Amino acid sequence: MKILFVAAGSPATVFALAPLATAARNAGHDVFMGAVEDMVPYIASAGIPAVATTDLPIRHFITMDREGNPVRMPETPEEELDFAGHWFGRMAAGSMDALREVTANWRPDLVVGGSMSFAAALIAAELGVPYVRQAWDTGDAWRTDPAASDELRPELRALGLDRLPDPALFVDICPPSLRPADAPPAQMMRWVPANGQRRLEPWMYTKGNRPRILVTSGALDAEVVIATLDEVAEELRTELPGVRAGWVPLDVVVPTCDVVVHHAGGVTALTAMNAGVPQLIVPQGGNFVEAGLRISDFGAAITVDENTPEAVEKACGELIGNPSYAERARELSAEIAALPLPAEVVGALEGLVE
């Protein structure tokens, strides 16, 4: 069958959907994936046919409302949910023209969107085909829905709907230990890494003679490796000469790490958990703060109060030196390993149209 996948504005949204997308293609299905023009290369380099949902940069959707007025940046977790609901909503509305043009000529039998790819809901409803929503991290996929329904109220009304429709199937990748009690029924799925890849160098997959701390933005007897965009790493290399910096495929390097330090990146969190590696979360905005708190409260992470070289250092020492954090992290890895494989989940997609 023909399946349209809809990712969003960031590479993690392509990566999180890639396992199920490639699983469907491996099962003989014809698969297209959509994302903003800037994300198209990430779809293509995941080996997936790529369509642009819009030729506008995401900042257009983030920093201004449907009228063109400035959007006040969120100062709190609660403000962040409403903020995210609205701008993902705006990006979804701006995605519809391109998606109609694609689907008039290549008609999908099913549409799969990520957590906040609301254009998938709209295009499926327009076409009269099942809408599948896949969680693209361990955070609640539905957490921005109220704001998103408001943002898309015009489009939803045109479809005879009062709010965002419930999906025909919710595919969740959140380990049972981390799922909140109010989580809606899901077809569970084992997450696997499918991040951007590079030519591998030995340091990436070889464990060193000292503990290794990976730092990414998406005192201690240890080495620090910086996982960042290559474009950024060039300038970073001048200011910090003797430190590994550049895009390093996280699935490859994380098994060599004692700690993964990140900004609250959902997919980085999954990579660390999956590998059984303790993680340090340093809040840098975003709505994944809450999902990070759950990992910390489970005992497989520490979330620090302040973004400080000082506060981070103490936490790193704790994650390395107290065996419990790695213990809980391996526990989460095992929970992930016990979930239904993407190959099996393709069967649930087939069942929706047969």
Ligand X SMILES: Cc1cn([C@H]2C[C@H](O)[C@@H](COP(=O)(O)OP(=O)(O)O)O2)c(=O)[nH]c1=O
Binding residues for dTDP: 247-248, 250, 263, 267-268
Q: Which of 64, 343, 352, 353 binds a copy of itself (CB under 8 A)?
A: 343
225: left (phi over 0), alpha (psi -120 to 50) or beta: beta
| Closest approach of Mg ion to the CB of residue 155, in Å | 12
Residue 251 binding a copy of itself, by CB under 8 A: yes
Compute CA distances 131 → 14, 51, 172, 256, whole Å. Answer: 18, 18, 14, 39
Cα 335 versus chain centre, distance: 19
In the complex, minimum distance from the CB of residue 27 to a copy of itself, in angstroms, rounded to a whole number: 6
Q: How near is the Cβ of 42 to ligand X at its closest, in Å?
A: 9
Binding mask 95-134 for Mg ion (x = CB under 5 A): ----------------------------------------
150 binds, among ligand X, Mg ion, a copy of itself, none (CB under 5 to 8 A by kind): Mg ion
What's the CA gap between 66 and 50, in Å, rounded? 26
Note whether 206 binds a copy of itself by CB under 8 A.
Answer: yes
Distance CA 158, CA 152 (A): 10
Q: Does 335 bind a copy of itself (CB under 8 A)?
A: no
Residue 341 engages a copy of itself in binding (rule: CB under 8 A): yes
* Amino acid identity, position 288: F
CA–CA dist 99, 160 (Å, integer) = 20
What does the block give as tokens for 280? 């340090």
Cβ atoms of residues 60 and 87 within 8 Å: no
Query: From the CB of 213, what's the least distance to Mg ion, in Å?
Result: 44
Residue found by looking up tokens 């997450």 in the block: 191
The rounded distance, in Å, linking the Cα atoms of 21 and 30 is 9
Nearer to ligand X, 110 or 319 (CB): 319
The amino acid at residue 178 is L
CA distance 143 to 352: 25
- CA 165 vs CA 35, 137, 266: distances in Å: 21, 21, 25
Nearer to ligand X, 177 or 228 (CB): 228
Binding-site partner at residue 317 among ligand X, Mg ion, a copy of itself, none, CB < 5 to 8 Å by type: none
If one asks whether residue 30 binds Mg ion (CB under 5 A), the answer comes out as no
Segment 147 to 166, residues that bind Mg ion, using CB under 5 A: 150
Binding site for ligand X (CB under 6 A): 10-12, 15, 195-196, 216, 218, 227-229, 247-250, 263, 265-268, 271
Q: Does 117 bind a copy of itself (CB under 8 A)?
A: no
Task: Count residues near a copy of itself (CB under 8 A).
Answer: 47
3-state secondary structure of 64: strand
Residue with tokens 């990992």: 295
* Residue 13 contacts residue 120 (beta carbons within 8 Å): no
Please state the closest distance from residue 25 (CB atom) to a copy of itself, in A: 6
Question: From residue 99, how far is each of 5, 209, 220, 243 by CA, in Å?
Answer: 11, 51, 51, 43
In the shown chain, the binding pattern of residues 59 to 98 toward a copy of itself, with x for contact by CB under 8 A and - for none, equals ----------------------------------------
Please tell me what DSSP assigns to residue 105. T
Contact residues: Mg ion, CB under 5 A? 150
Please give the residue ranges that form the binding site for a copy of itself (CB under 8 A). 18-19, 22-23, 25-28, 30, 32, 37, 40, 43-52, 101-102, 105-106, 190, 192-194, 196-200, 202, 205-206, 249, 251-252, 255, 337, 341-343, 346
